[PDB]
């Protein structure tokens, strides 16, 4: 038979029982669908940086370890 169609009673206090949880807000976010031709060039930037650093590290290690 006829029933209660709808109510929002008790819903707010159910919501506040375990608090209104906030998003975690991580430091880094995925760049998957974001600005291609910019993040690809950033990949190239980082590769250049890593190679320039790593060749110095290899040189120093080799010359200090004979």
């Amino acid at each position: 038979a006829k029933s209660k169609n709808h109510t929002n009673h008790n819903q707010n206090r159910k919501a506040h029982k375990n608090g209104i949880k906030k998003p975690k807000k991580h430091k880094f976010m995925s760049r998957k669908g974001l600005d291609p031709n910019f993040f690809r060039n950033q990949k190239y930037c980082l590769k250049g940086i890593q190679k320039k650093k790593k060749e110095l590290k290899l040189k120093a290690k080799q010359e200090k370890n004979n």
Binding site: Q11, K14, I20, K22, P23, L34
Partner: protein, 155 residues
């Protein structure tokens, strides 16, 4: 029964009195950078890139910038938790936010203030002063303007 995209937006998505017409050409020159805050105010003259009804008047952070559009992270309350929503709009519907403008001006002002104070090696309190109870005042008023007040009768 009816829950379309722009349902309920009869007044919110209407241009103000004598404020109709497209946006000024100066709006397109507004500088936007990643991570800065932004308000989502829908401009009904521009139909493409229009945000959803809910986000009109919400502030968010830029997470993406395209040739004519911006992606902004907006907190939306969904029952028992908040969640970030990535709303993608055109630049006409978005505006640089002043939500932290006092914070930025405070940062510069305090930078110079504590720079000079540390130069003069003084320990200064830099936080905002949350003004409360005022001190005593020894204030004199000419008795020619002290007005006596009585409650008024009925007419």
């Amino acid at each position: 029964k009816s829950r379309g995209k722009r349902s309920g937006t009869r007044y919110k998505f209407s241009k103000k009195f004598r404020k109709h017409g497209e946006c000024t050409a100066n709006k397109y020159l507004e500088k936007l950078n990643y991570g800065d805050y932004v308000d989502i105010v829908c401009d009904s003259t521009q139909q493409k890139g229009m945000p959803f009804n809910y986000y009109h008047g919400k502030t968010g952070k830029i997470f993406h910038i395209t040739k004519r559009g911006v992606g902004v992270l907006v907190n939306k309350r969904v029952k028992h938790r908040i969640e970030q929503k990535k709303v993608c709009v055109r630049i006409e519907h978005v505006r640089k936010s002043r939500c932290n403008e006092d914070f930025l001006l405070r940062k510069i002002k305090n930078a110079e203030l504590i720079k000079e104070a540390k130069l003069k090696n003084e320990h200064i309190n830099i936080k905002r002063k949350t003004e409360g109870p005022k001190p005593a005042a020894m204030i004199k008023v000419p008795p020619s303007k002290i007005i006596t007040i009585e409650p008024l009768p009925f007419y």
